[PDB]
From a paper:
Acinus (apoptotic chromatin condensation inducer in the nucleus) is a protein involved in apoptosis and alternative splicing regulation. All of them contain an RRM domain at the C-terminus and a conserved arginine/serine-repeat (RS repeat) region that are frequently present in splicing factors. Later, Acinus was also found in ribonucleoprotein complexes: the spliceosome, the apoptosis- and splicing-associated protein (ASAP) complex and the splicing-dependent multiprotein exon junction complex (EJC). Acinus was shown to regulate splicing of a subset of apoptotic genes in human cells and to facilitate constitutive splicing of pre-mRNAs containing a weak, alternative 5′ splice site, favoring the mRNA isoform generated from this site.
We crystallized and determined the structure of the RRM domain of the human Acinus protein spanning residues 1008–1100, at a resolution of 1.65 Å. The structure of an AcRRM monomer shows a classic four-stranded β-sheet fold with two flanking α-helices and an additional non-classical α-helix at the C-terminus. The two molecules in the asymmetric unit of the crystal structure are very similar (rmsd of 0.25 Å for 91 Cα atoms), despite the fact that no non-crystallographic symmetry (NCS) restraints were used during the refinement. The two AcRRM monomers are covalently bound in the crystal structure via a disulfide bond, that generates an interface area of approximately 500 Å for each of them (calculated by the PISA server). However, computational modeling of the disulfide bond removal by replacement of C1083 with alanine, results in the CSS of 0. This indicates that in the reducing conditions the dimerization does not take place and the dimeric assembly is likely to be a crystal-packing artifact. RNP1 comprises residues 1049–1056 [KSHCFVTY], with the deviations found at second, third and fourth position of the consensus sequence (underlined). RNP2 comprises residues 1014–1019 [VHISNL] with deviations at the second position of the consensus. H1015 and F1053 are present in these positions in AcRRM and are likely to fulfill the same roles. The aromatic residues of the RNPs in AcRRM are exposed to the cavity potentially creating an RNA-binding area which is occluded by the C-terminal α-helix in the absence of the ligand. Interestingly, the 10-amino acid-long C-terminal α-helix of AcRRM has a caspase-3 target sequence and can be truncated by this protease down to six amino acids.
Author numbering:
A (entry chain A): 1006 to 1100
B (entry chain B): 1008 to 1098
The structure:
Amino acid sequence: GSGKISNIVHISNLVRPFTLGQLKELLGRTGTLVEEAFWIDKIKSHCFVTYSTVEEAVATRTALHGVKWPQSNPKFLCADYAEQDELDYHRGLLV
Amino acid sequence: GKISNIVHISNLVRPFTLGQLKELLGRTGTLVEEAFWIDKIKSHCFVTYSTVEEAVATRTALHGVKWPQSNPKFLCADYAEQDELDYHRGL
């Protein structure tokens, strides 16, 4: 299970309910988020989390892939690395 | 998440043959055989389909499935761009 390493972690299988503050608290345990790059979809099913270093992104992917969050989520999270092109497609910056 | 003709499947765990994995993958479309890539240790794979619609049928079918039956994990299936595949292939 090896996506190309980068400073962006793509987390899937998120299920409501949860607040953005709760998600951001989980994410900050393993590094420092770049707030200005952060992205989540309207329905809170997946997000792209840019970290201050690549090493923080690797710590976070490692910690979060295959965990259950929130506690009552029926799914386990899928966490992998993402390229800027993928993030920017979702931000509406690239076709 | 960007829709493509390449499905990336992770959380594979042995034992399984390539025959069994390919049979599974073929349930939902035609593979471009020469494009298929798996790691030497059989933990994740990129699967090119002959059309985009076949890749989407596959992603939908396999994301979150436990395969093989013995796998302690559930599969993660998502789309990939050609240059992700090319990175793993060498280029």
